[model samples]
Target chain A: SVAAPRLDGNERDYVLECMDTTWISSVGRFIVEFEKAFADYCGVKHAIACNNGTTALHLALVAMGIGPGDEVIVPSLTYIASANSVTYCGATPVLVDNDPRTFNLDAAKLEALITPRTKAIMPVHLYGQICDMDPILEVARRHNLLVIEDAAEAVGATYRGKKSGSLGDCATFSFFGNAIITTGEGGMITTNDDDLAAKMRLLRGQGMDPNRRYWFPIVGFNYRMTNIQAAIGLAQLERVDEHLAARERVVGWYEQKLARLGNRVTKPHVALTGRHVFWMYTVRLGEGLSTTRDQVIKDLDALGIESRPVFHPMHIMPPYAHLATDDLKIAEACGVDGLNLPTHAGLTEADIDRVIAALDQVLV
Target chain B: RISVAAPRLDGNERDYVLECMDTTWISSVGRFIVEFEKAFADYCGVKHAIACNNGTTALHLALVAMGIGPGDEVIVPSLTYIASANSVTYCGATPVLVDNDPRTFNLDAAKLEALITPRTKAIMPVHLYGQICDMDPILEVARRHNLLVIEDAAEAVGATYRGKKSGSLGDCATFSFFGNAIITTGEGGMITTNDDDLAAKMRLLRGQGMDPNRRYWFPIVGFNYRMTNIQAAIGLAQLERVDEHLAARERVVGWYEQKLARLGNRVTKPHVALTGRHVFWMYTVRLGEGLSTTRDQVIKDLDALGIESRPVFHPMHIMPPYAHLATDDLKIAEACGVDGLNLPTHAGLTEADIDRVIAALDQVLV
Candidate 1:
């Protein structure tokens, strides 16, 4: 099982300082400072911090002016949040199936989903690997669509020498406890447009103009980030480089140990033009394998190890099942067979060996 | 310097907040929040009290619960906080400003009768400066005109009118717990109502409009207005000693009235209605004719004497944003805004501090 990181004295002290200053709620200096530091880190001109990942996606879509009578094209293979955000905007989420080889959006089939009502394309960088953004950008340019990159799982991953968040019109990141950096519960949206950034900032704080106190110029909701959470986020951002390096080291060990398994299970792959941060060392069980993914999970559980199934496809979920026009055959296949092994930075060499031994015993 | 208002944390505010941290109930849900709602509802004599992130969200939910939306117009006083009008705007409704009663400094119930168009949905009476608005006349007009009444009791929590609490006389009421109020929870608000369905609707809407039976499925659009239990813990402590705190304010008011009684021809004391309980949230006094001082000058004079003071609430009808919507002659509101001063009324003051403030005001007015 992947262990959670223990907060050091510096992080603990920062949290206490936040409480001592009475900056425990959403409106305080920590929230603004965290946004500045994070936006600079992502090489973006602006960033708006929010309460969670879902709200960040919702704000990005709302700020982009995508709402009812609009359709957003999203991949069916990513987490439900990528598709759920579209529904939150009162728009339809058009699901495109993943490419079997790269397990990313099938760029070949994306154009067919574009219609007059199609307003944007949301490409989720799943499993800490960047999507092929060059083709996606070309498709967006042709269709005159905005691109919102769901980089919730990719903080350190890069595509074509640029960060994952820098390629889209807007990008969203999650700082949940299990993410590359822990903030208890926080999220952020990054963009280069000044107007969009201002709208996002206004919308997050009840739509009240900064110059006016207790006056709201537009209809807004309370989607603010607490200073306490930002304090934890600031501490986490300081150690992110070390955290990314540790995860990369774990990925290297897993790659060397699992190389001998060959075709029994396929390891995660990185595109030659991208850098994968390995948020989750996901692997697919090969065809004609002796055992199923569920059996391997049971073996891992018996040996005190933890493994998770791949995300259930959005097209198969109850809410969106009626909207599925395409067959999504590849997504259905991945949902049933792909397994995500323990891949947090806290995992040790012995933990990787234990996971590999259990997989071999269950498969052979 | 003594300030106009500061939170009175006498009973257990610090202790309860410390306990909240000890229990790790800092993120929205815990036992103190549930207890605070129950205690507050009981105190207000309402069936339910729903706590939210702030007073604006509380009023927003109250409007949403009553089905006030586009094409509806809400009549509000032009002499209260901007939040009173902004909440109506958030519901996609128009806020029609009306002039206040020159004497009581509240929405003139008679004036509301003429502003009722067919689209008028509600009459929001703000109990400005801890005095309950003349709710009986307002409610009578509301009953005849078929309009709902939502009380903006943010400044009048412990106040009463003719033995009835400010919250009990209206269809619904909202209270703020900001730092400068009678009670504080850092920044929070509560909605008190007698209706059950409306209460349930508010509970569901303050959360993300999720059905209790099924998780992660949203049936309606809602907001994140949930109040943290940590704040509620502070609220519970503050509520316990609210009466004592109000008594302290009343004592200050009495001292100021006695000290300034001889200078009545030069300055007017805060108007107190005989049938209501005046808790003195702010010891507001009006500048009489030939006072030879503007409100700003009086404030500066008080500051020179090491006494902090503030001008009365600006009339919304004359504010830059709402000036275009003004339809009435708000002469009284404008006069009150220009000629009024608010002295210290917090529980932090001692009798010596009150005497010092009275001396400072006497020097300027007399």
Candidate 2:
């Protein structure tokens, strides 16, 4: 439980200065500087900032040449944005089940779905925990497929000592206000490939070549991040280490407080080599539990403790209801049983105690 | 000596901006957007106004609404910002650069007729430097050629041509609320059109092409060109005093003309058409016969005198990237590029500031 760090005078001044300079729109120095700094920090060759996490994924897929007639494998249990980005590229998203331990895409089930048209595998690192990347990369290499790591919830988390973003061919991060680092509403795509990076840059800026002032060589979208938002991003990046440390401390508190709950609910797990930053302390309700995941969320809300169920499985969403297959039973099951408690940096030790007391009253 | 455009933020700008902060509508949606669009459309005598993030997006959407795409050619002046032509290219159309008339510094209507071919789809006449391009003849040419007319009226928002506002003369007109324009909005734009269908199409295109039936759904690959409510708030406040702003700009032009007239054949003022209301977005002056100093030298002198001046918009055809297309001898545009300088014409400029600019010009030119 930690109080969210409020913006210092320096951060507030920079945000105001961006507006005062009339650089509120997409094109400005802050946008460029933030992209450069984030790319450098993430150990990627390039980073393209976009308006939102969904748009960042869309741009990453497009840069990989994903389009109509192609199919992308995605974790069915993650947020809709993971699959929606592939759909935005005119490709079909084939949902795959997740490993119960990692709650990430099950690598063992991956190759079974690979077909001639399967263009890529988007392994999502859910709830601030890094996915097991060693096997995910092995499957990708064997199939000659592209790997796009959906690291929206795992920005500072590491996999096998390597940063989550560095584990994939391309990775995307979100900066929603709730994220570890935020620009109010922004996203970034990081890549090691020079060509992909170049395409991402051109695509983000309406597909115009940097060398040519006003000429367009391809059709592009207006996904550029505003300088004003980037000003906030710069400030957020400065406090990222602090934010991660605070969230980790909160996660430790949850683990200690909830140990007595027993096997009724499974706490978030991490591989020995993986550093789970716990963006959200998501817990899965075991079968025959005293209450269901939805009931737990409602009970918490009734007690003035805000919590939410994990995202509805992408395959179960109305948009992709027809895509559900028997293989996705685990993902569908996980979707109904998992709950995300209020784990934001804003939470204090008092708030955590309130959440624990409320949960114990309902469950025990 | 009279420097070119200075941003006119009438002390009220900061106040209105603070109001935006108070309201917490700093992003694309807000009350200021509605007010700004309504007031802008009313001023233009248009049925609808769609606010965009910038003038470039405004022009891009206008072209998309017109269905000007691949294989189509748009006739544009080679004497404006690269954005004028770039917007056409954004819509998948090729921008055919046209030469400007020596006297008016606008697209030469006479030369335009020869450039027309089967591929030509529209004519984009820019009201460069706030003087209305010879739109009457340009409109006639467009009608004869069965071409659409999209006015690059970014610099001539309040200016009128032949008693009619610039926005009303073309099928559609786009304006920039950039700081250096007649008004300041930090970064905003608007597209004005009388056609309801085109207006509707533009609205959809700017907001991700969502069908009216379903809000979350997207039917076409559109864009997020919508201007934030915060910027619109500033624009609404600025529009309240636009007429007064225009008058102050005219007064500045008069002062510059009076002081430089004595230079006698060494400097030439921008020719204002008799039938038009020249709002003078930028008070431009061209070097005349035997002017010993270059335009750069004059800009340097003005800089030394604490007056900011800029060379005329570089002719697009002569730019390094587009230089290969400098097939035509745009004598007028090239001359303007070398000799023309834009003086300070912002509403914030005082009569004393105008005299300061003129005095600096006198020292250098005399």
Candidate 3:
């Protein structure tokens, strides 16, 4: 299991601002301020807030006019949301393999999946490592397809020295309770295009044109984030840098203690160009090990050490099984052997030693 | 220009919100969400209530839970908020927009059976502007045709029809806590029903369609329509003061009523024949027969006097998206859109504010 959000900051005060000022609804000072601050942090021209990351994906796909008869290429290793979002737009989600090294969308194979019907490629930055965006961008440009980055798990992470949120045409960040910094439940879409931002904002606010009072010209959604949620997000954004630093410290402790285990456990990998902020300190257990990933999880639980497994690769998920890859290689191995250790910001060196000791016992 | 509607934070709102944060129950799971849903369901005389992220999603989920989708038709009012119709659109179903009743500003229930077809699946009667719709005939026709009744009570939460609550009059109902509603949860909604199966399904649908027992093993497509626990905390607090909040909104409407009584010929208020308790979500006035000044012109004139007013919804037949959905006679709906205007009706509005709004309207009229 992962850690809950750390909220010993100004979250309480800003939330009070919304209630005290009676701006608790969609129209509030913090919502506007948070959107601006988030946009700046993501290094984008605009950041439109939504209720959650799922809705953000839906909004982005819709705003791009990617609908029926279109195809979106997603990774077979990422969370279901990446593929589920495409399904929401009545489009097909073509599953691609992941890189054995990065455990991210295998950019080398992305070009082959390109076709006349492919509308976009959703490259997810899974577990704090950004995908190889340079090659992905090259392929996307050559094919005239949109590249959308899922930075839900990569906040505060960077690829080629650029923030994960600034890597593609646009990116989405989720502030769910499990993130390094959180709003309990919040999501955002960051972009540089003016027209797309305006169109997405219109859809976010119920498609009511700014010029009219009660006139709705087009079908839209109520994806607006509450002012209370934004207030908490603003507080989190202010301290995200500090949280990321603390999280890195935790991951470093794990890396050093586990380095002695060698081939027994494949400690978290860091791509040459990708910088890991350790949103989750996930590693893989080698196939030579005796016990299954589930047995290891149960052993950790017995030791009072809480842990979790990596995503159940999209290829095997029941809803997306039809889109499963026939010759799935990397993702299948990751799903079977991947393990996520306790790396919350609260974990100290002593805690890491206990985790390493228990992990050692379980692996044996 | 004066603002339209604002939320009032009184009672236990601050305390519950603080508790919601301190306990870290701010995401999806919390006592606040459960208590809020239970309290709201009890208030609406329903057996179960499912809290959702927003009013639109609640309506959409209701349709999804009922198994209404493509090739299905949901008859809605052309004069209500777009969410009423868009909920149908999200299901890949078509919205059959009907005219508003001349008196209550609700769907013309008497014209219900005529629109029924082999594709018609549900009758969505929207209670607009805090007044209950004529539900007796609507229910009778639906029963005769075996059509489902999904009450769009996003506006008239506690308003009544005959002796029953607005939401309780139909098979299922939805409520929104927007700026003008009697109770607000920052931006949240609830769907109430008596069917246990339907209530369980909506919970699954709101939570990304994951199986409740097996976490993350999704069998169906769902949405992230879960309301934050913080929002539910505020909603429970608002419900704790429901009587006072509802009374404050109604009192403001009464002030406008008493102030505009002498100039009855120049101002047309809500018709009294609707026969229900109107909560006056946003006190609206009609420019029918005795009034002057067009809807937009009146909105601007009120703005000049440090007052605020708004036009009613543009008939669905005239809107870009719903234009192709129906070709029915929307003459009355268009008349309401052109001649109707709404005034600020927040809990904080004073009697003097009501008087000022009336005098400004009179000046614009005469």
- TM-score for each model: 0.75, 0.71, 0.97
lDDT of 2 by residue, B1-366 (tens): 333554555545666656655543455656878888999989888888999877877898899999999899999988887778778765667888888877668888888898899999999999888888888788899999899999998888888876788788788989987757887665568999999999999998887665566423444546656776556766887888888888888887888777777666777888877867888888887877487788788877778888887778778777654575576557788888778878778766777887787777878873
Tens-digit lDDT string for candidate 3 (B222-289): 88888888989889999899889998988887888788885667657877545668888877777755
Candidate 2: where are CA atoms >4 Å away?
A: A1-12, A17-157, A162-227, A237-364, B1-6, B11-24, B144-146, B162-168, B210-216, B289-307, B320-331, B350-352, B359-366
lDDT of 1 by residue, B1-366 (tens): 777666666677666765654544555657888899999988887789999767777888888888889899999988887778878876778998888877678888778888899999999999988898888899999999889999999888888888877777778899987667787775788999998988888888777565565334445656556777667887899889878888888787877877777565776778888877987788787788687787777878888888888777777767655777777567777778777777788888888898888777778874
- Name the better of 1 and 3 by DockQ: 3
lDDT of 3 at B297: 81
Tens digit of lDDT per residue, candidate 2, span A167-278? 8999999876567777655789998999999888878776666754344556576667767668778887878887787787777788888876777778877767678888
- Native-referenced TM-scores of chain A, all candidate models: 0.96, 0.95, 0.97
DockQ leader: 3
Model 1 over residues A86-165: C-alpha lDDT tens digits? Answer: 77667899999886656788777789999999999998888888888899999999999999999998987888878878
Model 3, residue pairs in steric clash:
A1-A307
Cα lDDT over the full model 1: 0.79
Ignoring the other chain, what TM-score does chain B have in each prediction?
0.97, 0.95, 0.97
Per-prediction DockQ? 0.15, 0.14, 0.71
Q: Could you give the interface RMSD of each candidate, to one decimal?
A: 5.2, 6.1, 1.3
